[PDB]
Amino acid sequence: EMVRFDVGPRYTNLSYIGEGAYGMVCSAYDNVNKVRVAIKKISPFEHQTYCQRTLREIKILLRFRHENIIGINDIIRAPTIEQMKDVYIVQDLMETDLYKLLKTQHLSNDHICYFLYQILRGLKYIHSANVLHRDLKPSNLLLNTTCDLKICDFGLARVADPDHDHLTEYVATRWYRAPEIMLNSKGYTKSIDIWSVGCILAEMLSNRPIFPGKHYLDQLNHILGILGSPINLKARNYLLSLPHKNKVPWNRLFPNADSKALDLLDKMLTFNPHKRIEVEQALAHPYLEQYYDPSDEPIAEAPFKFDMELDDLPKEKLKELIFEETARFQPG
């Protein structure tokens, strides 16, 4: 143990990396496989949406298997469900993320291009499984080298559902939230993930968030402040009929940017979801022609039969399902 509480076996001499939703996140050492790994410690059993995000990320990441998607190595808990109050997710130790990198470094076009490729390569897998990440942002893209990118945090990950109408349903990180979400186009579409990637590409090009709104109405203010002016929004919230703006050309916002990059950016940051470019079409863009290779882009074996449509479940129940899932990592 230490200070920062935790429990090895089978990992020792850890190190603080920070705290997110629930504590460490600590870089410990592996006794069996002989490496430095990253253990995440979760204590979600006090609320409902907490275990939900815990059970989701566990169920999904175990079934996923891709070079651009973080994997679950080990999960250690108390052998009895009565004592189980903490969960320890063990994952590969990554050096940093795209968020930290963009604070200390201007990325070259070559590096930006391959970073974009790896993200979409990972997204291609996710979407082929009919799954939405819903929370893509630079801090959720882990990096080891320029050629090693891994998507993480699937706590908000839903199975796609374009046909179904979902202050409930929360959240997508504001700066990277697609316009359709804020205008109650309630369907869970794959287009929301592409929007995030668009914002992410825009952020790589200039080391700053393209739409850094304060609140969700200010977010739409920023979005329309670039794309210009385009009503189904039945809140208020209605009075967005304010200063009408013309669409700002990307080459004026990013003058030193590769023209093919800016062209793909325009197609990802499209206001209308139905017009917005899909993941395969994105990879097949002239901007990624030197990397695009379907034979080297593994997709999921089969689309996900639903996330069990689980939202309103008692916490003592999904307590067991986590216990049922994680039972494989017990030595017995």
Ligand X SMILES: c1ccc(Cn2cc(-c3c[nH]c4ncc(-c5ccncc5)nc34)cn2)cc1
CB of 219 to ligand X, least distance (A): 22
Determine whether the annotation assigns residue 71 to a binding site. no
- Quickly list H helices, 129-215: 179-182, 191-204
To the query of whether residue 165 is one of the catalytic residues in this protein, the response is no
Determine whether the annotation assigns residue 22 to a binding site. yes
Q: Which residue's CB is nearer to ligand X, number 91 or number 128? A: 91
Q: Which residue's CB is nearer to ligand X, number 154 or number 188? A: 154
CB of 282 to ligand X, least distance (A): 24
Single-letter amino acid code for the residue at 300: A
Q: Which residue's CB is nearer to ligand X, number 142 or number 194? A: 142
Rounded Cα distance between 250 and 202, Å, is: 10
Determine whether the annotation assigns residue 7 to a binding site. no
CB of 186 to ligand X, least distance (A): 27
Q: Which residue's CB is nearer to ligand X, number 142 or number 322? A: 142
Determine whether the annotation assigns residue 19 to a binding site. yes
Rounded Cα distance between 247 and 143, Å, is: 34
DSSP summary character for residue 27? E
- Spatial contact of 201 and 102, defined as CB atoms under 8 Å apart: no
Residues that bind ligand X (CB under 6 A): 17, 20-21, 25, 38, 40, 70, 91, 93-94, 96-97, 142, 152-153
Length of the chain in residues, anyone? 332
The residues, ordered by sequence, that sit 6+ positions from 214 with a Cβ below 8 Å of its Cβ are none
* Preceding-residue numbers of gaps in the chain (C–N over 2.5 Å): 4, 166, 230
CB of 112 to ligand X, least distance (A): 20
- Quickly list H helices, the chain: 49-63, 98-104, 109-128, 179-182, 191-204, 216-227, 250-253, 259-268, 279-283, 315-325
Determine whether the annotation assigns residue 70 to a binding site. no
Closest residue to ligand X in the complex (CB): 20
CB of 18 to ligand X, least distance (A): 6
- Spatial contact of 19 and 25, defined as CB atoms under 8 Å apart: yes
- Spatial contact of 172 and 180, defined as CB atoms under 8 Å apart: no
Determine whether the annotation assigns residue 40 to a binding site. yes
Determine whether the annotation assigns residue 131 to a binding site. no
Q: Which residue's CB is nearer to ligand X, number 21 or number 84? A: 21
Helix axes 49-63 and 315-325, enclosed angle (nearest 10): 20
Say which of 6, 74, 86, 135 is annotated catalytic: 135
Rounded Cα distance between 305 and 28, Å, is: 35
Q: Provide the annotated binding site.
A: 17-25, 40
Q: Which residues are catalytic?
A: 135
Residue ranges at the known binding site for ATP: 17-25, 40
